[PDB]
Amino acid sequence: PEMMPETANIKLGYIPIVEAAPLIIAQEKGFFAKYGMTGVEVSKQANWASARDNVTIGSQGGGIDGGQWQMPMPHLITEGIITNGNKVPMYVLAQLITQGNGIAVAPMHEGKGVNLDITKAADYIKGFNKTNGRKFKAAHTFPNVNQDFWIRYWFAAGGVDPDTDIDLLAVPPAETVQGMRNGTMDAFSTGDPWPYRIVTENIGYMAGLTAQIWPYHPEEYLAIRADWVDKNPKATKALLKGIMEAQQWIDDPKNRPEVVQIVSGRNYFNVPTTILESPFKGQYTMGDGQPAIDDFQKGPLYWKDGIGNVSYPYKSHDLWFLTESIRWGFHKNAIPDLDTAQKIIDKVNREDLWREAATEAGFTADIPSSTSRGVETFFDGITFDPANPSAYLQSLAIKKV
Ligand SMILES: [Ca+2]
């Protein structure tokens, strides 16, 4: 009864991308059941807006109790910032993965220098309307979160202001890719399994992977409503242990063929396994005359990366997401300063539960010693010191503060 979950049921949402792997694998390989969570429903969300709506509603209303999220969605939902004032407190419990994301660009931009560092192509992009009849058009999957941040960082590092120099919009992924085929979309912030299809089907090329923009960067996370977690503490830790074991399992190369087979199944991603076999080996055809990537360390990682533990949710990473939100002037009234950002993080990030769950499960040797992963370094040399986010913001060339 000590480890017995208060309830064996929970509804967790996911989006059909590699970031969802730990949830799918924990369920399909019996890791959730091992700890008593035999009633986990891994529910596919139609899109990010729908996932947001479903967690706001909650399972009792026909929605979800938590799930996979781009950052800082849990924080924004907790503060009612993206729910029209409906504050639904949530807890960030674990990071699901790092990498497995990238930026794609249309073929018409090849030989223009639109690669990892777009500095030399800045003027080309900025004057696209006069030369090509329209503003450079790029898209993400939901505003103010991960993909938006990745493409914005990429543009801004090369001298392109994502708010004034281009048309950065939120567009469905299928509509976005179709746009690239039609010659109306110039680039988009995506992730696996999308890159493979884009390059193999000559829809475009890969300007760069997020693994190149910020090696081992924080990515998507598991977050559950605070009311559910507060009511079911034992069940919450059981879920964490199941996820941790699944992450460890996924990172063993020997299990990746099965991982790919399972997630690509009809009842999940529903896509040909061939489009994910390469990424899970760290293999990517970049195109545009650039060398292909062949490095396991540059593909998706779920348990351990080159810096620290992937799963442990470092508060310094929540801090970067809120600091970058401030950089772009997002939620000007709700998050007006870094102090407010830290207060939100202390209410949302529950790294303490991750530590507790890891300890009980026997993973003490993998627990990071600090809540900070230290100074972070981006591909353009900019560094983020969690101890001084103000200095990070001031070191950036393009920003709204
Ligand atoms: Ca992502």
Q: Are 78 and 47 in contact (CB under 8 A)?
A: no
Q: Are residues 234 and 361 in the same domain?
A: yes
Distances (CA, A) of 12 to 68, 205, 235, 338: 7, 33, 13, 31
Q: Among 84, 68, 187, which residue's Cα sits nearest to residue 139?
A: 187
Q: Are residues 205 and 116 in the same domain?
A: yes
User: How many angstroms does the Cα of residue 143 sit away from the middle of ligand 1?
Assistant: 12
Q: Are 8 and 38 in contact (CB under 8 A)?
A: yes
User: How many angstroms does the Cα of residue 5 sit away from the middle of ligand 1?
Assistant: 30
- Report which residue type is found at 375: V
User: How many angstroms does the Cα of residue 192 sit away from the middle of ligand 1?
Assistant: 8
CA 215, 303, 53, 237 dihedral sign is: negative
User: How many angstroms does the Cα of residue 22 sit away from the middle of ligand 1?
Assistant: 14
User: How many angstroms does the Cα of residue 83 sit away from the middle of ligand 1?
Assistant: 21
User: How many angstroms does the Cα of residue 94 sit away from the middle of ligand 1?
Assistant: 15
CA 117, 121, 126, 132 dihedral sign is: negative
Q: Are 103 and 187 in contact (CB under 8 A)?
A: yes
Distance CA 219, CA 15 (A): 14
**10 Å Cβ neighbour count for 379?**
17
User: How many angstroms does the Cα of residue 32 sit away from the middle of ligand 1?
Assistant: 23
**10 Å Cβ neighbour count for 275?**
19
Q: Are residues 352 and 273 in the same domain?
A: yes
Q: Among 286, 310, 145, which residue's Cα sits nearest to residue 215?
A: 310
Q: Are residues 289 and 351 in the same domain?
A: yes
User: How many angstroms does the Cα of residue 215 sit away from the middle of ligand 1?
Assistant: 14
Distance CA 199, CA 75 (A): 35
- Report which residue type is found at 54: N
3 state SS for the chain: CCCCCCCCEEEEEECCCHHHHHHHHHHHCCHHHHCCCCEEEEEECCCHHHHHHHHHHCHHHCCCCEEEECCCHHHHHHCCCCCCCCCCCEEEEEECCECCEEEEECHHHCCCCCCCCCHHHHHHHHCHHHHHCCCCEEEECCCCCHHHHHHHHHHHHCCCCCCCCCEEEECCHHHHHHHHHHCCCCEEEEECCHHHHHHHCCCCEEEEEHHHHCCCCCCCEEEEEHHHHHHCHHHHHHHHHHHHHHHHHHCCHHHHHHHHHHHHCCCCCCCCCHHHHCHHHCEECCECCECCEECHHHCCECCECCCCECCCCCHHHHHHHHHHHHHCCCCCCCCCCHHHHHHHHHHHECHHHHHHHHHHHCCHHHCCCCCCCCCEECCCCCEECCCCHHHHHHHCCCCCC
Q: Which residues contact 9 (CB under 8 A, 6 or more apart)?
A: 37, 39, 40, 41
Question: Which domain covers residue 256, as residue numbers?
Answer: 1-98+213-379
Q: Which residues contact 117 (CB under 8 A, 6 or more apart)?
A: 157, 158, 379, 380
End-to-end, the C-alpha distance of the chain in Å comes to 53
Q: Which two tokens stand for residue 179?
A: 């746009």
Q: Are residues 105 and 245 in the same domain?
A: no
Distance CA 76, CA 63 (A): 18
Q: Are 191 and 147 in contact (CB under 8 A)?
A: yes
User: How many angstroms does the Cα of residue 133 sit away from the middle of ligand 1?
Assistant: 31
Q: Which residues contact 401 (CB under 8 A, 6 or more apart)?
A: 326, 327, 329, 393
- Report which residue type is found at 283: Q
Distances (CA, A) of 391 to 154, 216, 379, 394, 401: 20, 22, 18, 5, 12
Q: Which two tokens stand for residue 361?
A: 């499960």
Q: What's the structural domain count of the chain? A: 2
User: How many angstroms does the Cα of residue 186 sit away from the middle of ligand 1?
Assistant: 19
Q: Are 48 and 256 in contact (CB under 8 A)?
A: no
Q: Among 398, 393, 376, 371, which residue's Cα sits nearest to residue 213?
A: 376
User: How many angstroms does the Cα of residue 131 sit away from the middle of ligand 1?
Assistant: 32
User: How many angstroms does the Cα of residue 130 sit away from the middle of ligand 1?
Assistant: 33
User: How many angstroms does the Cα of residue 70 sit away from the middle of ligand 1?
Assistant: 6
User: How many angstroms does the Cα of residue 19 sit away from the middle of ligand 1?
Assistant: 7
User: How many angstroms does the Cα of residue 149 sit away from the middle of ligand 1?
Assistant: 10
Residue position matching structure tokens 């988009």: 188
Distance CA 376, CA 356 (A): 26
Using alpha carbons only, what angle is made at residue 51 by residues 70 and 230, rounded to the nearest 5 degrees?
Answer: 80
Q: Are 220 and 71 in contact (CB under 8 A)?
A: yes
Using alpha carbons only, what angle is made at residue 14 by residues 313 and 306, rounded to the nearest 5 degrees?
Answer: 35
Q: How many residues does the chain have?
A: 401
Q: Which residues contact 290 (CB under 8 A, 6 or more apart)?
A: 115, 205
Q: Are residues 67 and 124 in the same domain?
A: no
User: How many angstroms does the Cα of residue 220 sit away from the middle of ligand 1?
Assistant: 6
Q: Are residues 227 and 320 in the same domain?
A: yes
Q: Are 302 and 97 in contact (CB under 8 A)?
A: yes
Distance CA 111, CA 205 (A): 11
User: How many angstroms does the Cα of residue 4 sit away from the middle of ligand 1?
Assistant: 33
CATH assignment of the domain containing 5: 3.40.190.10
Q: Among 347, 348, 382, 387, which residue's Cα sits nearest to residue 370?
A: 387
Q: Are residues 317 and 353 in the same domain?
A: yes
Q: Are residues 241 and 256 in the same domain?
A: yes
CA 294, 279, 170, 60 dihedral sign is: negative
Q: Which two tokens stand for residue 144?
A: 């103010």
The bridge status of strand 66-69 relative to strand 9-14 is: parallel
Q: How was this structure determined?
A: X-ray
Q: Are residues 304 and 384 in the same domain?
A: no
Q: Are residues 244 and 320 in the same domain?
A: yes
Q: Which two tokens stand for residue 257?
A: 């063929």
Distances (CA, A) of 127 to 135, 137, 156, 189, 253: 8, 12, 15, 21, 46
Distance CA 48, CA 71 (A): 12
Distance CA 232, CA 7 (A): 7
**10 Å Cβ neighbour count for 385?**
15
The bridge status of strand 383-384 relative to strand 66-69 is: unpaired
User: How many angstroms does the Cα of residue 208 sit away from the middle of ligand 1?
Assistant: 14
Q: Are residues 392 and 355 in the same domain?
A: no
User: What values do phi and psi take at 255, rounded to 5?
Assistant: -95, -10
User: How many angstroms does the Cα of residue 98 sit away from the middle of ligand 1?
Assistant: 9
User: How many angstroms does the Cα of residue 312 sit away from the middle of ligand 1?
Assistant: 17
Neighbour-count burial of 333, counting CB atoms closer than 10 A to its CB (0-12 exposed, 13-18 middle, 19+ buried): exposed
Q: Among 373, 393, 376, 394, which residue's Cα sits nearest to residue 385?
A: 376
